[PDB]
Paper text:
We further optimized the potency of Nb6 by selecting a saturation mutagenesis library targeting all three CDRs. Two rounds of selection identified high-affinity clones with two penetrant mutations: I27Y (Ile27→Tyr) in CDR1 and P105Y (Pro105→Tyr) in CDR3. We incorporated these mutations into Nb6 to generate matured Nb6 (mNb6), which binds with 500-fold increased affinity to SpikeS2P. mNb6 inhibits both pseudovirus and live SARS-CoV-2 infection with low nanomolar potency, a ~200-fold improvement compared with Nb6. An x-ray crystal structure of mNb6 alone revealed dramatic conformational differences in CDR1 and CDR3 between free and SpikeS2P-bound mNb6. Although differences in loop conformation in the crystal structure may arise from crystal lattice contacts, they are suggestive of conformational heterogeneity for unbound mNb6 and induced-fit rearrangements upon binding to SpikeS2P.
Author numbering: 1 to 118
The structure:
């Protein structure tokens, strides 16, 4: 019933930009905590950017600071990841994850979307 759907991936040239979107149904992002994850070739999945529940503070992995921006659009119940100045090292499967509003083991996860930087 709860669905996170990602879009906005594909192939881009180094130096370009992409916007990832994460659209939820059966669930409202609200002020819940959420994050964007990525799994690069040969690597474990790692957290790239997130928003806290408490105080709605954005945070970023050092490797993306100053280049990526997370934003939340309550009217659209959609969270975005704006990726600027993309590097080949950014190539990966990107995932969004959101905290459920009530008690639960586990988050809600999108399906993942491929971002390839040439
Ligand atoms: Cl928090």
């Amino acid at each position: 019933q709860v669905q996170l759907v990602e879009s906005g991936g594909g192939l881009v040239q180094a130096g370009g930009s992409l916007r990832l979107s994460c659209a939820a149904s059966g669930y409202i992002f609200g002020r819940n905590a959420m994050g964007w994850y990525r799994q690069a070739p040969g690597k474990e999945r790692e957290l790239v950017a997130g928003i806290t529940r408490r105080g709605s503070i954005t945070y970023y992995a050092d490797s993306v600071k100053g280049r990526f921006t997370i934003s939340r659009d309550n009217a659209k119940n959609t969270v975005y990841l704006q990726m600027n100045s993309l590097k080949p090292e950014d190539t990966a499967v990107y995932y969004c994850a959101a905290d459920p509003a009530s008690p639960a083991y586990g988050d809600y996860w999108g399906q993942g979307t491929q971002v390839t930087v040439s």
